[PDB]
Design a protein around this motif. Sequence first.
Motif, PDB file in Angstrom:
ATOM      1  N   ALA A  42      41.514  37.761  81.468  1.00  0.00           N
ATOM      2  CA  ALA A  42      40.679  37.135  80.380  1.00  0.00           C
ATOM      3  C   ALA A  42      41.033  35.692  79.845  1.00  0.00           C
ATOM      4  CB  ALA A  42      40.405  38.013  79.395  1.00  0.00           C
ATOM      5  N   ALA A  43      40.035  34.805  79.780  1.00  0.00           N
ATOM      6  CA  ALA A  43      40.196  33.534  79.099  1.00  0.00           C
ATOM      7  C   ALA A  43      40.754  33.964  77.677  1.00  0.00           C
ATOM      8  CB  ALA A  43      38.855  32.922  79.132  1.00  0.00           C
ATOM      9  N   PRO A  44      41.754  33.247  77.136  1.00  0.00           N
ATOM     10  CA  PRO A  44      42.501  33.350  75.857  1.00  0.00           C
ATOM     11  C   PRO A  44      41.360  33.266  74.729  1.00  0.00           C
ATOM     12  CG  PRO A  44      44.059  31.862  77.167  1.00  0.00           C
ATOM     13  CD  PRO A  44      42.464  32.027  78.151  1.00  0.00           C
ATOM     14  N   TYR A  45      41.690  34.179  73.713  1.00  0.00           N
ATOM     15  CA  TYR A  45      40.815  34.078  72.318  1.00  0.00           C
ATOM     16  C   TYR A  45      40.520  32.459  72.058  1.00  0.00           C
ATOM     17  CZ  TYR A  45      39.075  36.429  68.019  1.00  0.00           C
ATOM     18  OH  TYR A  45      38.469  36.871  67.262  1.00  0.00           O
TER      19      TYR A  45
ATOM     20  N   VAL B 246      38.251  45.905  84.577  1.00  0.00           N
ATOM     21  CA  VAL B 246      37.653  46.667  83.368  1.00  0.00           C
ATOM     22  C   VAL B 246      38.770  46.326  82.199  1.00  0.00           C
ATOM     23  CG1 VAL B 246      38.927  48.956  83.530  1.00  0.00           C
ATOM     24  CG2 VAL B 246      37.038  48.708  82.091  1.00  0.00           C
ATOM     25  N   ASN B 247      39.903  46.138  82.033  1.00  0.00           N
ATOM     26  CA  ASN B 247      40.681  45.927  81.142  1.00  0.00           C
ATOM     27  C   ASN B 247      40.581  44.278  80.603  1.00  0.00           C
ATOM     28  OD1 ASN B 247      41.838  48.213  80.694  1.00  0.00           O
ATOM     29  ND2 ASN B 247      43.344  47.989  82.216  1.00  0.00           N
ATOM     30  N   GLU B 248      40.398  43.444  81.488  1.00  0.00           N
ATOM     31  CA  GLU B 248      40.251  41.974  81.222  1.00  0.00           C
ATOM     32  C   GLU B 248      38.742  41.704  80.852  1.00  0.00           C
ATOM     33  OE1 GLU B 248      42.553  40.256  81.492  1.00  0.00           O
ATOM     34  OE2 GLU B 248      43.638  41.857  82.460  1.00  0.00           O
ATOM     35  N   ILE B 249      37.530  42.557  81.008  1.00  0.00           N
ATOM     36  CA  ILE B 249      36.205  42.457  80.785  1.00  0.00           C
ATOM     37  C   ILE B 249      36.121  42.976  79.474  1.00  0.00           C
ATOM     38  CG2 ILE B 249      33.935  43.064  81.357  1.00  0.00           C
ATOM     39  CD1 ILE B 249      34.759  43.420  84.025  1.00  0.00           C
ATOM     40  N   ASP B 250      36.789  44.087  78.895  1.00  0.00           N
ATOM     41  CA  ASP B 250      36.834  44.504  77.724  1.00  0.00           C
ATOM     42  C   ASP B 250      37.383  43.490  76.915  1.00  0.00           C
ATOM     43  OD1 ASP B 250      35.990  47.292  78.549  1.00  0.00           O
ATOM     44  OD2 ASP B 250      37.972  47.977  78.091  1.00  0.00           O
TER      45      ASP B 250
END
Length: 474
Positions: A38-41, A78-82
């Motif tokens: 996931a791209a960082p916050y 799933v963990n990255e999409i979440d």
Amino acid sequence: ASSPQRGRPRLNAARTTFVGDNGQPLRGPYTSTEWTAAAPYDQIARVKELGFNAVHLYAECFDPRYPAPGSKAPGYAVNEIDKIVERTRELGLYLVITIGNGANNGNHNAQWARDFWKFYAPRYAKETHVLYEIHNEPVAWGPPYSSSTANPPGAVDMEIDVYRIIRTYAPETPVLLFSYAVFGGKGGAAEALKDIRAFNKAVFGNENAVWTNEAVAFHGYAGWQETTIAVEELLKAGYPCFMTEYAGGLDVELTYELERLGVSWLTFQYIPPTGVSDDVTKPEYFSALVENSGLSWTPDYGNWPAARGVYGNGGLARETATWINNFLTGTTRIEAEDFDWGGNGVSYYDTDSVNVGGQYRPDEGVDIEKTSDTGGGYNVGWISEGEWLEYTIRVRNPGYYNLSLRVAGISGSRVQVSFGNQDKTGVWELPATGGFQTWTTATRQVFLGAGLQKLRINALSGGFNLNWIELSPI
Ligand SMILES: O[C@@H]1[C@@H](O)[C@H](O)OC[C@H]1O
Ligand SMILES: O[C@@H]1[C@@H](O)[C@H](O)OC[C@H]1O
Ligand SMILES: [Ca+2]
Ligand SMILES: [Ca+2]
Ligand SMILES: [Ca+2]
């Protein structure tokens, strides 16, 4: 509510697109969780400072060999999409989730797509900021998917089957259909309408269904002119749409048309740190293009782009005229007093906040008086060193233009003119005319690129008045 989370986007009153919980179109870049974290916050948060309120997510890449031994099933990311779902929730952003294609754009695996949505549709059904886009570019390269000779065939059956899956588990979630790669011309709209009718018959019982929570996703690869036509025709037929992928960096011309038509858009520049195209945070691929063009919209967050617009001309960018034989197809004249609205330091700079001439636009800062020049009207006066004036124009054809300034001055003065923040004139000496209502036309040849761009007059000295500006091709 006690949450930055955005409310359900819904079709706008005009039924042109999905708009957010403030009535504004969705505008955003993209990211991917297909093979990356996931791209960082903190990187996702940057989109808010670039005038965006949405993110396009290519969530997982389909496996063309599924379900054979060794194939990768959906649900692996799933963990990255979440994380993307949570980060957009908290940042007050919309999220458009789709299936990506990797090396296999213009293709799909129907079973893989059905299994993806059986998992993800219920998972994010209650996330009010999340929209579902059935499948990126499932056919090479555009409508009609319903043709027996589509490459590959059967995509409308996948759209139908997936739509039913989605609606079973996510009855309120916006759905974006088809995701046409190349969507161009009156023909593109007519072919899309075949697909729409076939889908509608199967799903809603009637070829001519009025959608309440669906739109056509399309991409920009037909080019801006042809895509604009197809969008216009589809909107006339009564089907909303949503731009999900396009590029020129930002395609400024197509963005201008989508803004005009009331269509949401997701541009094909990525949120850092990585993506397959170009980084949206690099000025050369987005913010500089927006700035130089004069493009503006109301951002959900911050004050960029700045509020501004064209004064007169029905708010449309002033298009340059062309020649047919020995005549001009339209006006070449931009009145100096018709500078873009937006304000001091945004669309003009004036050394006094009051319009000391009092005329025409009394409540803005540029100093305007009645002119005795041929044709009457007004002129900009009280011009002082360092002042400037911007005019948003649209250069129809690249090449050489005569740029004319209608000017008067007791003594000598100096100006310089930029187009899209590029100097096209250098220092331009304006000799004295002997009076502030003794008018002459000063002309210089300039070389312009095509497209939306701001013409900016920079006063390098005071001592001149400006009635109007003319531009015509050589
Ligand atoms: O896999 C995706 C692909 O389908 C699209 O062409 O570009 C974004 C990619 O990540
Ligand atoms: O620009 C001019 C201003 O400088 C003068 O002093 O008042 C008349 C205007 O035309
Ligand atoms: Ca002033
Ligand atoms: Ca002034
Ligand atoms: Ca004038």
